[PDB]
Design an enzyme around this catalytic site. Structure first.
Site, PDB file in Angstrom:
ATOM      1  CE1 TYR A 145       0.815   2.250   0.287  1.00  0.00           C
ATOM      2  CE2 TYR A 145       0.617  -0.035  -0.339  1.00  0.00           C
ATOM      3  CZ  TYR A 145       0.682   1.298  -0.697  1.00  0.00           C
ATOM      4  OH  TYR A 145       0.629   1.691  -2.005  1.00  0.00           O
ATOM      5  CG  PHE A 181       2.471  -6.763  -5.395  1.00  0.00           C
ATOM      6  CD1 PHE A 181       2.898  -6.490  -4.100  1.00  0.00           C
ATOM      7  CD2 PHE A 181       1.589  -5.866  -5.994  1.00  0.00           C
ATOM      8  CE1 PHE A 181       2.444  -5.371  -3.423  1.00  0.00           C
ATOM      9  CE2 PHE A 181       1.152  -4.752  -5.315  1.00  0.00           C
ATOM     10  CZ  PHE A 181       1.597  -4.488  -4.055  1.00  0.00           C
ATOM     11  CB  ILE A 235       5.488   0.035  -0.997  1.00  0.00           C
ATOM     12  CG1 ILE A 235       5.133  -1.050  -2.010  1.00  0.00           C
ATOM     13  CG2 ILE A 235       4.281   0.844  -0.583  1.00  0.00           C
ATOM     14  CD1 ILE A 235       4.225  -2.132  -1.484  1.00  0.00           C
ATOM     15  CE1 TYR A 253       0.093  -1.908 -10.551  1.00  0.00           C
ATOM     16  CE2 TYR A 253      -1.004  -3.154  -8.836  1.00  0.00           C
ATOM     17  CZ  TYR A 253      -0.834  -1.963  -9.526  1.00  0.00           C
ATOM     18  OH  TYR A 253      -1.545  -0.831  -9.255  1.00  0.00           O
ATOM     19  CG  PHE A 311      -4.416  -5.072  -2.626  1.00  0.00           C
ATOM     20  CD1 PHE A 311      -3.628  -4.162  -3.317  1.00  0.00           C
ATOM     21  CD2 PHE A 311      -3.779  -6.107  -1.972  1.00  0.00           C
ATOM     22  CE1 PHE A 311      -2.260  -4.307  -3.412  1.00  0.00           C
ATOM     23  CE2 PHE A 311      -2.408  -6.246  -2.036  1.00  0.00           C
ATOM     24  CZ  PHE A 311      -1.657  -5.336  -2.752  1.00  0.00           C
ATOM     25  CG  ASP A 312      -4.843  -1.553  -7.883  1.00  0.00           C
ATOM     26  OD1 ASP A 312      -5.938  -1.480  -8.442  1.00  0.00           O
ATOM     27  OD2 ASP A 312      -3.909  -0.782  -8.130  1.00  0.00           O
TER      28      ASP A 312
HETATM   29  C1  LIG Z   1       9.276   3.703   0.223  1.00  0.00           C
HETATM   30  O1  LIG Z   1       7.980   3.783   0.787  1.00  0.00           O
HETATM   31  C2  LIG Z   1       6.966   4.442   0.166  1.00  0.00           C
HETATM   32  C3  LIG Z   1       7.173   5.192  -0.999  1.00  0.00           C
HETATM   33  C4  LIG Z   1       6.096   5.836  -1.583  1.00  0.00           C
HETATM   34  C5  LIG Z   1       4.833   5.748  -1.026  1.00  0.00           C
HETATM   35  C6  LIG Z   1       3.676   6.449  -1.714  1.00  0.00           C
HETATM   36  C7  LIG Z   1       2.801   5.421  -2.416  1.00  0.00           C
HETATM   37  C8  LIG Z   1       3.603   4.642  -3.460  1.00  0.00           C
HETATM   38  C9  LIG Z   1       2.795   3.507  -4.023  1.00  0.00           C
HETATM   39  N1  LIG Z   1       1.570   3.606  -4.567  1.00  0.00           N
HETATM   40  O2  LIG Z   1       1.230   2.364  -4.932  1.00  0.00           O
HETATM   41  C10 LIG Z   1       2.238   1.530  -4.588  1.00  0.00           C
HETATM   42  C11 LIG Z   1       2.088   0.097  -4.820  1.00  0.00           C
HETATM   43  C12 LIG Z   1       3.278  -0.529  -5.514  1.00  0.00           C
HETATM   44  C13 LIG Z   1       3.285  -0.091  -6.990  1.00  0.00           C
HETATM   45  C14 LIG Z   1       2.007  -0.545  -7.665  1.00  0.00           C
HETATM   46  C15 LIG Z   1       0.793   0.095  -7.002  1.00  0.00           C
HETATM   47  N2  LIG Z   1       0.868  -0.221  -5.555  1.00  0.00           N
HETATM   48  S1  LIG Z   1      -0.381  -0.945  -4.758  1.00  0.00           S
HETATM   49  O3  LIG Z   1       0.176  -1.609  -3.568  1.00  0.00           O
HETATM   50  O4  LIG Z   1      -1.004  -1.867  -5.671  1.00  0.00           O
HETATM   51  C16 LIG Z   1      -1.506   0.219  -4.226  1.00  0.00           C
HETATM   52  C17 LIG Z   1      -2.604  -0.411  -3.347  1.00  0.00           C
HETATM   53  C18 LIG Z   1      -3.509   0.690  -2.819  1.00  0.00           C
HETATM   54  C19 LIG Z   1      -4.176   1.371  -4.002  1.00  0.00           C
HETATM   55  C20 LIG Z   1      -3.135   2.066  -4.882  1.00  0.00           C
HETATM   56  C21 LIG Z   1      -2.126   1.031  -5.386  1.00  0.00           C
HETATM   57  N3  LIG Z   1       3.205   2.215  -4.024  1.00  0.00           N
HETATM   58  C22 LIG Z   1       4.638   5.001   0.140  1.00  0.00           C
HETATM   59  C23 LIG Z   1       5.718   4.371   0.735  1.00  0.00           C
HETATM   60  O5  LIG Z   1       5.586   3.628   1.882  1.00  0.00           O
HETATM   61  C24 LIG Z   1       4.321   3.579   2.533  1.00  0.00           C
END
Ligand SMILES: COc1ccc(CCCc2noc([C@@H]3CCCCN3S(=O)(=O)C3CCCCC3)n2)cc1OC
Length: 107
Positions: A82, A99, A56, A26, A36-37
């Protein structure tokens, strides 16, 4: 929620099941295109399992609609991302995320 727009098609037959590991690449962008990533930047796919609150919500629902080989644009509302908190220093409050995702493999 989540909108999915196909960039290149997948096989239309191999779709992620609850409890399978999705292997993707991604790049995440804010709506203005600011990156952002990216897993591609680290030369290493991202892995997660459906049904385990690992991603997410817009990813859970968006990647679930993809088949192996597909590349898609996922546009995700903040309620499905988020929310008010954002991600410190990386994603602002109340952000719509875009994404570019490729579903490489199911394990
Ligand atoms: C069902 O909802 C929730 C469930 C769980 C959590 C925990 C975090 C899960 C998660 N971590 O990363 C991400 C996303 C999507 C996957 C790829 C990485 N990214 S990303 O958007 O690119 C992110 C951007 C900030 C830096 C880290 C990477 N999802 C949060 C939730 O809602 C806030």
């Amino acid at each position: 929620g989540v909108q999915v727009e196909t960039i290149s098609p997948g096989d239309g037959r191999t779709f992620p099941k609850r409890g399978q590991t999705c292997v993707v690449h991604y790049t995440g962008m804010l709506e203005d295109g600011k990156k952002f990533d990216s897993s591609r930047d680290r030369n290493k796919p991202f892995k997660f399992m459906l049904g385990k609150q690992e991603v997410i919500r817009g990813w859970e629902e968006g990647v679930a609609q993809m088949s192996v080989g597909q590349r898609a644009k996922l546009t995700i509302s903040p309620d499905y991302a988020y929310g008010a908190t954002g991600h410190p220093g990386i994603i602002p409050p109340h952000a719509t995320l875009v994404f570019d995702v490729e579903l490489l493999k199911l394990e």
